[model samples]
Target: NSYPGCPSSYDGYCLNGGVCMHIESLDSYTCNCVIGYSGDRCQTRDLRWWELR
Candidate 1:
């Protein structure tokens, strides 16, 4: 679980209520957001000018 505006699962590590971001490049278990997608559930568009409107 996580609040809003913070990376719940950063890189390959999962966090709750805002925490650290651990990233391991060039390896398996790759964790990240898809293209043009981002959020606590990765179910919406990323932060942009129009999104704030």
Candidate 2:
């Protein structure tokens, strides 16, 4: 079985606490990392957290 965010059969698509992002285009797949991590695959680390209103 597979999901839209995770097209692959594997369950580990993104790192950290990030979620997979799938668009209807090239380089479509990306990550929606939580606070602290940020990147295409949520590989980056050591950052701030700011969620403005």
Candidate 3:
């Protein structure tokens, strides 16, 4: 089946204003997380960069 575009809030999975994108080729999808955000659905925050600088 073809993946579908994310909804307005993506069921709250994507965070920090991240956008969800469907990967048709993989028959899957993931969130396009912004800086400092990382995860299969942008659910986690990567703060290591903050501590480094």
Candidate 4:
């Protein structure tokens, strides 16, 4: 517990601040991201790059 993590897994596993779900009955896991995020594992966001001029 050196850093913050989804009470179920570690960082980098889910790019955004998403909750982790362990499928013990299955052979995998997934993520449910916070607002403004989306992906199979919450790895992407809709926010586009806007150069600060």
* Per-model tally of clashing residue pairs: 0, 0, 0, 0
lDDT of 1: 0.39
What lDDT does the true structure give each of the candidates? 0.39, 0.64, 0.63, 0.55
Compute the lDDT for candidate 4: 0.55
* Winning candidate number (lDDT): 2
lDDT of 2 by residue, 21-44 (tens): 666645356668878777767766
The 10-residue segment of model 4 with minimum total lDDT is 1-10
lDDT of 3 by residue, 1-53 (tens): 45566544556666755676777766565667766766666666677424447
lDDT by residue for model 4 (1-53), tens: 22222434355576565666555544466667766566677666656321222
Which residues of candidate 2, in runs, are more than 4 Å off?
1-4, 25-27, 43-53
Better model by TM-score, 2 or 4? 2
By TM-score, who's the top model here? Answer: 2
Clashes of 4: 0
Ranking by TM-score: 2, 4, 3, 1
Instruction: Work out candidate 4's RMSD over C-alphas.
Output: 6.8
Worst 10-residue stretch by lDDT in candidate 2? Answer: 44-53
lDDT agreement of model 3 with the native: 0.63
Error of 1 at 21 (Å): 13
Residue pairs in collision within model 3: none
Tens-digit per-residue lDDT, 1-53, candidate 1: 22323243444343222233333442223234544455674444555523556
Pairwise lDDT winner, candidates 1 and 4: 4
Pairs that clash in candidate 2: none
